[PDB]
Design a protein around this ligand. Structure first.
Ligand SMILES: OC[C@H]1O[C@@H](S[C@H]2[C@H](O)[C@@H](O)[C@H](O[C@H]3[C@H](O)[C@@H](O)[C@H](S)O[C@@H]3CO)O[C@@H]2CO)[C@H](O)[C@@H](O)[C@@H]1O
Ligand SMILES: *[C@@H]1O[C@H](CO)[C@@H](O)[C@H](O)[C@H]1NC(C)=O
Ligand SMILES: *[C@@H]1O[C@H](CO)[C@@H](O)[C@H](O)[C@H]1NC(C)=O
Ligand SMILES: *[C@@H]1O[C@H](CO)[C@@H](O)[C@H](O)[C@H]1NC(C)=O
Length: 606
């Protein structure tokens, strides 16, 4: 279709499948295996990307051009890598992935949304769609085209260090929140075939339903461990949201480090190929987790030849290596050259990778758009995050007896008020994990508004606001305070550092609440990724709010505390009386919660 040097795969007017087939039929084995290889920016150079025909790059948690980097610094980095990939013989653009799991959260100045557990408390799938939309814009602000989200784990045990990445213990709520997908990617057309990949164009991103499957079902919530449950329970609890993701055209699926009845997911041909591909008709690409193939073996990495064979035969398409690319490529080449892995398997993996790349427009818009940089941390997006934070809050108590005047909403005009606690003025704590670093951090780690700052922004000009991080009882009794707002809770974590068998918050936390509330009526704001032991905090407090990990926009908290809006959040998880009860989920035969799933007290707006 027209100049003498025409190449069908480069013609943007042609159908995606024809483009895929045209390009695939021109590729060498080295070109093919290159597409299946995703590497860390940390090991990427222009020559490495060209010489190994690399298909994809990622930033792992905290893998950044430098701390504090601007949106344009990110665009320039990604475009430098892209220029190298475009200079190859076939000029196949790379796709760049990142964990944009509550906003574009590795990036300084990105809006940070509530984590998933709080989003589940909103029961507002349209809010979550609008978050996916805003997140796509902030990811493309940085030149990145692919987000490793949503996590659709159904966390069945809050001792898991990733429980905050799960919208709920109830699969129906997780199903509902798959609306993130068409927010990130755009809505699928009317005619759409379930399981096809979809991204609307250069202002959207490829999404990733993760981690397939049962990552939330592991024994005692041990991260990356074994999920022991019969097929009926796997299909009833852990699988359903994957079908909703197919129906909404999720572009990619990431495999879990976990096992199902002792079989590693990264080696599970029956589930990856027999179920996802052949039964759900998934036609996008299947990506490993980080060194996921290495962890097939015990110890991890002890027979990488086997890891490559087992994973590729199971049906994985793209391997997040992410560092030892030379060894990966060499081993996979040898297996194909030996007949251990048939060309048909290679050609399927590459078909799927190319299908997502062509579908999303990456061959037409391989480079960043400098006009999108100003989307990062845009006030409209912060206003959305503030709405989300406020909707996510669950009011657990609002008065010590049935006869007390309700403490919340608090008056904005008072002579003097106290704001206290370890989490009242700590932006990193209020954001939790996957913020700037994987594990999060402490203090002013990005642009935002802490609880203290939000209080000062809300109150009448006549109200004197005193901050004391950990005041003693005398200080409170002598201070002439009308009331106190005290914020405490968990430190940031992810993955296996967050696995926690006791679920008691660090001190000083309870002791500050006791000191404060003993001297003046108090509203306790608990920041956590999950339910934690709460009776002692409840006993001390007049009012108590489960604010989860609300993100950068602390004014969401004060919007409800001062009555601009009423409390509407409902628990998306069971609140246990004791950790010896766990696991314990709604619907279990022996269900004895402190607060059941769905519990939440309400207030009306002033
Ligand atoms: O990020 C791509 C996919 O990565 C994997 S593993 C991911 C871990 O969940 C996270 O805990 C880990 O954080 C470590 C940093 O990489 C280290 O540099 C520092 S020293 O310590 C932290 C935590 O120990 O990072 C890994 C790489 O990002 C996930 O399971 C996927 O959900 C994620 O998409
Ligand atoms: C589960 O963790 C235990 C205890 O750490 C470990 O020995 C075992 O290999 C893990 N199992 C799986 C399947 O990951
Ligand atoms: C609870 O477990 C965490 C994480 O495993 C540990 O670091 C902490 O000290 C524990 N708390 C108590 C009271 O044992
Ligand atoms: C809040 O509004 C509801 C619904 O109108 C009402 O029934 C309830 O009495 C109200 N509570 C307060 C404190 O105004």
């Amino acid at each position: 279709h027209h100049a003498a040097d025409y190449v069908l795969y480069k013609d943007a007017t042609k159908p995606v499948e024809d483009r895929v087939a045209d390009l695939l039929g021109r590729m060498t084995l080295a070109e093919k295996i290159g597409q299946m290889t995703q590497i860390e920016r940390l090991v990427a150079t222009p020559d490495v990307l060209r010489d190994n025909f690399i298909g994809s790059l990622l930033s792992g948690g905290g893998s950044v051009p430098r701390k504090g980097a601007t949106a344009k610094e990110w665009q320039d980095m990604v475009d430098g890598f892209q220029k190298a990939c475009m200079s190859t013989r076939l000029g196949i653009p790379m796709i760049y992935g990142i964990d944009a799991v509550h906003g574009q959260n590795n990036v300084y100045g990105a809006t940070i949304f509530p984590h998933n557990v709080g989003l589940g408390a909103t029961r507002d799938p349209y809010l979550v769609k609008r978050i996916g939309e805003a997140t796509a814009l902030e990811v493309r602000a940085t030149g990145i085209q692919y987000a490793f989200a949503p996590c659709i784990a159904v966390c069945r045990d809050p001792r898991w260090g990733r429980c905050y990445e799960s919208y709920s213990e109830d699969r129906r709520i997780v199903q509902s929140m798959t609306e993130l997908i068409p927010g990130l990617q755009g809505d699928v057309p009317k005619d759409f075939t379930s399981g096809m990949p979809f991204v609307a164009g250069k202002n959207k991103v490829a999404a990733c339903a993760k981690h397939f499957v049962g990552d939330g079902g592991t024994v005692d919530g041990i991260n990356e461990n074994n999920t022991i449950i019969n097929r009926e329970g796997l299909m009833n609890i852990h699988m359903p949201a994957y079908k909703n993701a197919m129906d909404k055209g999720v572009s990619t699926v990431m495999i879990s480090y976990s096992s199902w009845n002792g079989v590693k997911m990264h080696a599970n041909q029956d589930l990856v190929t027999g179920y996802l591909k052949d039964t759900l008709k998934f036609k996008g690409f299947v990506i490993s987790d980080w060194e996921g193939i290495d962890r097939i073996t015990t110890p991890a990495g002890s027979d990488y030849s086997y890891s490559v064979k087992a994973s590729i035969l199971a049906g994985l398409d793209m391997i997040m290596v992410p560092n030892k690319y030379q060894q990966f490529i060499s081993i996979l080449t040898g297996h194909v050259n030996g007949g251990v892995i048939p060309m048909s398997r290679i050609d399927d993996a590459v078909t799927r990778i190319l299908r997502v790349k062509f579908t999303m427009g990456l061959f037409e818009n391989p480079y960043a758009d400098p006009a999108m940089a100003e989307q990062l941390g845009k006030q409209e997006h912060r206003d959305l995050a503030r709405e989300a934070a406020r909707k996510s809050l669950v009011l657990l108590k609002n008065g010590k007896t049935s006869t007390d005047a309700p403490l919340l909403p608090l008056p904005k005009k008072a002579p003097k008020i106290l704001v206290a606690g370890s989490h009242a003025d700590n932006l990193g704590y209020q954001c939790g994990g996957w913020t700037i670093e994987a594990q999060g951090d402490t203090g002013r780690t990005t642009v935002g508004t802490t609880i203290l700052e939000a209080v000062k922004a809300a109150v009448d000009p006549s109200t004197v606001v005193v901050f004391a991080e950990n005041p003693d009882a005398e200080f409170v009794k002598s201070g002439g305070f009308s009331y106190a707002i005290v914020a405490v809770g968990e430190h940031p974590y992810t993955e296996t550092k967050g696995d926690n068998l006791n679920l008691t918050i660090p001190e000083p936390g309870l002791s500050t609440v006791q000191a404060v509330c003993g001297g003046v009526r108090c509203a306790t704001v608990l920041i956590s990724g999950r339910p934690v032991v709460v009776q002692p905090l409840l006993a001390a407090s007049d009012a108590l709010v489960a604010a989860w990990l609300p993100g950068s926009e602390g004014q969401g908290v004060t919007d409800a505390l001062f009555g601009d809006f009423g409390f509407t959040g409902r628990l998306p998880r069971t609140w246990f009386k004791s950790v010896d009860q766990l696991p314990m989920n709604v619907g279990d035969a022996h269900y004895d919660p402190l607060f059941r799933l769905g519990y939440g007290l309400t207030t009306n707006a002033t």
